[PDB]
Design goal:
heterotrimer; A mainly beta (about 220); B mainly beta (about 210); C mainly beta (about 200); B: about 210 residues; mainly beta; Immunoglobulin-like; 2 domains; 6-stranded mixed β-sheet; 4-stranded antiparallel β-sheet; rod-shaped; C: mainly beta; 18 strands; about 0% helix; binds 2-acetamido-2-deoxy-beta-D-glucopyranose; signal (chain C); transmembrane helix (chain C); receptor (chain C); immunoglobulin domain (chain C); disulfide bond (chain C)
Chain lengths: ~220, ~210, ~200
């Protein structure tokens, strides 16, 4: 019962190099011809290349040649696949599979497959928050809306105000953008006589926005 | 180098209809074509090799035909386990090329809506149960709103959904509105509003006491 | 173990398209297993158990209906162990080529097909296709490769094969090939009989 196990998912930046392993059991690794197939998000299945049975030399596809190196280690009973230069197009699920052959030197298909490995280029997509006042025991606050991704940090008076501060967990809106609110419970007489400024920082977008909450 | 053109790209099918998938080759590949099945998340599975030869553990409903440049995959009777994406791959010449894939998807079925007024026998007990029936719908996400007169109600409804049926991958939903007899007598028009992807517009089924 | 097996090709290394050729690994050295390796567009290794007849160990590998991937330089390795697969020194190479993938060339003889003894004969391979090189074959099993001249004003790509002073006569055929695909040849030219009177 030939079986194939693969390496774990990898998140890599553009221009990096990724290596995926394919461990084989249930037979002699030298008898197996292990190929590598890529499944892109929109594209279907693409044969990138495969190792020859005994000697370990690899046939390649022209499209993937130059950035893909396919190797094998007989001691570990494991096959490897390495992408040289990572681009956003390379983000896909990469499979390894055993190709079975019949008479005449022909191969008829890939009968055994691995579980697949997810490689993902860096997302590099952020959106800054918009801060609006929740205007004023009394309650004041700030509505941090339409930001991506998490997290967002909220402070009050540059951190000098901690009493009565409740910063709610974030919710994912229908737009796919996050939003949260921070509120402060405040003595009523202090509204016209005390200053309340919410300091919102979104480090992914490196945006820092401060808003003074004024009673209306 | 050998280009494989697969048609159709998508099949909206229900359980039991014959589905035919074709794969055309840019040049003659003989009988060296393989058909694969990939269910979501899992890896591709080889179903047929040598155009017609089935692998072990593959049901007989899967059949493969063709030679040269024209090939076909026919599933005589579809089942719920057969809803997946199917690919054809040539094995004739080294740049082994797969087809674009055929996505066999479950057909979106709009729900048939029925509203059931409370029974006179049940009304003698002092409680009234208004039932709204959504039958044979896919997908399983639906919004059932109870509107007595034109006012929406909230805390007086419970729901129950059937398990997916094999003969037709269709869910069924029942929404039960329980009110008192005096509350039931105060208002006249009782309506059930349903919004579903298969329904073009939100459907309203209503009755007036009398 | 630097004892090399021998690799033969029945009927011949020139196999027509979609036809089958038997590659035989044979040796006086006793081998229990044989491995057939191909270098080319599609590299692959085939195994066959060894058969013992007299003192010769032999295996008739079968290369099926000829296609582009099955053409290349074949070298046969030998072994008596299976799980170790202790590999012998490689056999002497054998280039298996596929024929009939392109239009046939034209083979002509100057001064002529029939000639007197000692008279020099030159065979000309011509085709309107842009064959980068031509191959001359006598009695099927032969290999004389010369680069081809480009587009003549006639529109023909030509190569001239000097046979030299004529002592033997034979049936010569011409094949055309492109430099990108070295093991993929064309249809055979119409055979030309050289007779020495
Ligand atoms: C290999 O084939 C040739 C020609 O068909 C035959 O003469 C020979 O006996 C065969 N050898 C074996 C070991 O089968
Ligand atoms: C090669 O010869 C065969 C006949 O043996 C013919 O059918 C085929 O068309 C020829 N190929 C070309 C490219 O003309």
């Amino acid at each position: 019962q030939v079986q194939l196990v693969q390496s774990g998912a990898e998140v890599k930046k553009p221009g990096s190099s990724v290596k995926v392993s394919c461990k084989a059991s249930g037979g002699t690794f030298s008898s197996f011809a292990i190929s590598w197939v890529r499944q892109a998000p929109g594209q279907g299945l693409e044969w990138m290349g495969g190792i020859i049975p005994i000697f370990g030399t690899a046939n390649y596809a022209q499209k993937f040649q130059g950035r893909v190196t396919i190797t094998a280690d007989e001691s570990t009973s494991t096959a490897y696949m390495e992408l040289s230069s990572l681009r956003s197009e390379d983000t896909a699920v990469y499979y390894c599979a055993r190709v079975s052959g019949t008479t005449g030197g022909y191969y008829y298909g890939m009968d055994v497959w691995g579980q697949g490995t997810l490689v993902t280029v860096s997302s590099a997509s952020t959106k800054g928050p918009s801060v609006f006042p929740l205007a004023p025991t009394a309650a004041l606050g700030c509505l941090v809306k339409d930001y991506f991704p998490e997290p967002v940090t909220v402070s009050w008076n540059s951190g000098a105000l901690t009493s009565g501060v409740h910063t709610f967990p974030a919710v994912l809106q229908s737009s796919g953008l996050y939003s949260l609110s921070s509120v402060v419970t405040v003595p009523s007489s202090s509204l016209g006589t005390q200053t309340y400024i919410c300091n919102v920082n979104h480090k992914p977008s490196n945006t820092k926005v401060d808003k003074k909450v004024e009673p209306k | 180098a050998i280009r494989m053109t697969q048609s159709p790209s998508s099949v909206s099918a229900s359980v039991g209809d014959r589905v035919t998938i074709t794969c055309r080759a840019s040049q003659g590949i003989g009988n060296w074509l393989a058909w694969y099945q990939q269910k979501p998340g899992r890896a591709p599975k080889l179903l047929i090799s040598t155009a017609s030869s089935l692998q072990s553990g593959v049901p007989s409903r899967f059949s493969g035909g063709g030679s040269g440049r024209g090939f076909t995959l026919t599933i005589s009777s579809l089942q719920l386990e057969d809803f997946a994406t199917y690919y054809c791959q040539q094995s004739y010449i080294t740049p082994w090329t797969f087809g674009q894939g055929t996505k066999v998807e479950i057909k979106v079925a709009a729900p048939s809506v029925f509203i059931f007024p409370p029974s006179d026998e049940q009304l003698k007990s002092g409680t009234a149960s208004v039932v709204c029936l959504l039958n044979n719908f896919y997908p399983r996400e639906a919004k059932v709103q109870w509107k007595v007169d034109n006012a929406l109600q909230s805390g007086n409804s419970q729901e129950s959904v059937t398990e997916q049926d094999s003969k037709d991958s269709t869910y069924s939903l029942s929404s039960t509105l329980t009110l008192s007899k005096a509350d039931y007598e105060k208002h006249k028009v009782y309506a059930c509003e349903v919004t579903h992807q298969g329904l073009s517009s939100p459907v309203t089924k209503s009755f007036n006491r009398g | 173990v630097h004892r090399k097996p021998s690799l033969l090709a029945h009927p011949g290394r020139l196999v027509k398209s979609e036809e089958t050729v038997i590659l035989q690994c044979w040796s006086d050295v006793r081998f229990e297993h044989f491995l057939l390796h191909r270098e080319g567009k599609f590299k692959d290794t085939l195994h066959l158990i060894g058969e013992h007849h007299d003192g010769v160990s032999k295996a008739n590998f079968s290369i099926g209906p000829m296609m582009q991937d099955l053409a290349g330089t074949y070298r046969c390795y030998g072994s008596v162990t299976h799980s170790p697969y202790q590999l012998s020194a490689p056999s002497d190479p054998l280039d298996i080529v596929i024929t009939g993938l392109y239009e046939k060339p034209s083979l002509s003889a100057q001064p002529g097909p029939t000639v007197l003894a000692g008279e020099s004969v030159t065979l000309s391979c011509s085709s309107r296709s842009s064959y980068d090189m031509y191959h001359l074959s006598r009695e099927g099993e032969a290999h004389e490769c010369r680069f081809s001249a480009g587009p003549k004003v006639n529109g023909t790509f030509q190569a001239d094969f000097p046979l030299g002073p004529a002592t033997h006569g034979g049936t010569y055929r011409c094949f055309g090939s492109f430099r990108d695909s070295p093991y993929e040849w064309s249809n055979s030219s119409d055979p030309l009989l050289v007779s020495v009177i």
